[PDB]
């Protein structure tokens, strides 16, 4: 299709190798490129982690106020939340949103330590059907996204299947899922990415990942004004592992996308 073609030409011009995976509600209808290759999650994985944390509160009620210590050697590369609460507490709802809406390293490795390891984000995307997602390492190594390496992978297909499920389907409580939403609508680092290739009217939760090998993904739950929501996974890497960030191939795969439809 045309959205294929103009998605190829901007993977080829963009000398880095491109995932995208929309899911159309209104039809459930699919557009996929590179859609079952693997890609490294980077902090797109957060976004696994914190909804385990929230099944878990189906049970645990008050789980999301329980207060987690931050110490000083908890503090990894990327802490811009945890870093104002070193020596004090957050709660659990505080690290699923610092997780989610500020990329927050540390916040993530309290996610996973609450979860029980790796393999409890990993057995939560089992236990709703996603046999592909794979979180094998904490923060901040689950970043390194070398070539071929299936550690802390998933492709867009899956991502996107998954995506939707636990914002729009029912993966999560009522509750939980609502709390998702709002925590993804408020997300502060993705005006450059999925965002800026949107009209400006378009609600959008998102959350994006960085790593490596200038790795830049997003994923985003889109809300058109009048019409059902899709559900867009743009994944992004690059040869070299010092490659800069390219958040307008993002962008640009959302524009395209967009003129689509
Ligand atoms: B994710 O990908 O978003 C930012 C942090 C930096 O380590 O990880």
């Given at each position: 299709s045309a959205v294929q073609q103009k998605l190829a030409a901007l993977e080829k011009s963009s000398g880095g190798r491109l995932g995208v995976a929309?899911?159309?509600?209104?039809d459930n209808t699919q557009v996929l490129y590179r859609?079952?290759?693997?890609?490294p999650m980077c902090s797109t994985s957060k976004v696994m982690a914190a909804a385990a944390v929230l099944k878990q509160s189906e049970?645990?009620?008050?789980?999301?106020?329980?207060?987690?210590?931050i110490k000083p050697a908890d503090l990894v590369n990327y802490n811009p939340i945890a870093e104002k609460h070193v020596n004090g507490t957050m709660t659990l709802a505080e690290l699923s949103a610092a997780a989610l809406q500020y990329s927050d390293n540390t916040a993530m490795n309290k996610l996973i330590a609450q979860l029980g390891g790796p393999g409890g984000v990993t057995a939560?995307?089992?236990?709703?059907?996603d046999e592909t997602f794979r979180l094998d390492r904490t923060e901040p190594t689950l970043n390194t996204a070398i070539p071929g390496d299936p550690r802390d992978t998933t492709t867009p297909r899956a991502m996107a299947q998954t995506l939707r499920q636990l914002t729009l389907g029912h993966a999560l409580g009522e509750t939980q899922r609502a709390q998702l939403v709002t925590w993804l609508k408020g997300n502060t680092t993705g005006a450059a990415s999925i965002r800026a290739g949107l009209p400006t009217s378009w609600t959008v939760g998102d959350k994006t990942g960085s790593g490596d090998y200038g790795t830049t993904n997003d994923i985003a739950v889109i809300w058109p004004q009048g019409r059902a929501p899709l559900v867009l996974v743009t994944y992004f890497t690059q040869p070299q592992q010092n490659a800069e960030s390219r958040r307008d191939v993002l962008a640009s795969a959302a524009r395209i996308i967009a003129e689509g439809l």
């Open positions: 929309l899911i159309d509600t209104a859609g079952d290759e693997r890609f049970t645990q009620k008050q789980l999301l106020n329980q207060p987690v210590e939560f995307a089992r236990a709703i059907g």
